[PDB]
């Protein structure tokens, strides 16, 4: 079956931010409200913010997982392309297959769903740094959505649960993803289709 990609503020009042990053030709990572749309570039950071209303208990862990937008093809695994699954970028951590890493963070943990098969990689909740209100995840996605044996220019949406230390469901949000060369431009470009 299709995981939930239903949004859930829940008991802690969660949900996702983004930084206004702009669509100039250096950008390397740009999120658009109007399409809830993030534009990145290939294995280069996406920040992503967790907002919070009150703080959750430790040991809560932040998943992050693909899926395909089109209803045809929700039941396919998003993983990466042959070419990028054999390619030598491993960073000791990651499966090789997972399109969604994360950087900066040795406490990282990657999950094959034995009975879904589905791609997921999750991180230990911190409360926002002293100056902040919001918690900043890394993440890299290691295909491109032009990638053909992979996404083949397939919109996905990344679903990021917060679940406390045995697993159980405290919020769900969900952005689509594009990983494309020139973001900027993308966004720009898919903005104008208004
Ligand atoms: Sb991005
Ligand atoms: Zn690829």
Redesign the pocket.
């Known amino acids: 079956s299709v995981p939930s990609q239903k949004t859930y503020q829940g008991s802690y009042g969660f949900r996702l931010g983004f930084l206004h990053s702009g669509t100039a030709k250096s950008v390397?990572?740009?999120?658009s409200p109007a399409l809830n749309k993030?534009?990145?570039?290939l294995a280069?950071?996406?920040?992503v913010q967790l907002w919070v209303d009150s703080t959750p208990p430790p040991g809560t862990r932040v998943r992050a997982m693909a899926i395909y937008k089109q209803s045809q093809h929700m039941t396919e695994v998003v993983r990466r392309c042959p070419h990028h699954e054999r390619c030598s970028d491993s960073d000791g951590l990651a499966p090789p297959q997972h399109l969604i890493r994360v950087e900066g963070n040795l406490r990282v943990e990657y999950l094959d769903d034995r009975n879904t098969f589905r791609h997921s990689v999750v991180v230990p909740y911190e409360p926002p740094e002293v100056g902040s209100d919001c918690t900043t995840i890394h993440?890299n996605?290691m295909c491109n959505s032009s990638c053909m044996g992979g996404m083949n220019r397939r919109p996905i949406l990344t679903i990021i649960t917060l679940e406390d230390s045995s697993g159980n469901l405290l919020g769900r949000n969900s952005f689509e993803?594009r990983?494309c060369a020139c973001?900027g431009r993308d966004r720009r470009t898919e903005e104008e289709n208004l």
């Open positions: 390397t990572c740009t999120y993030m534009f990145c570039q280069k950071t996406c920040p993440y996605y993803m990983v973001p």
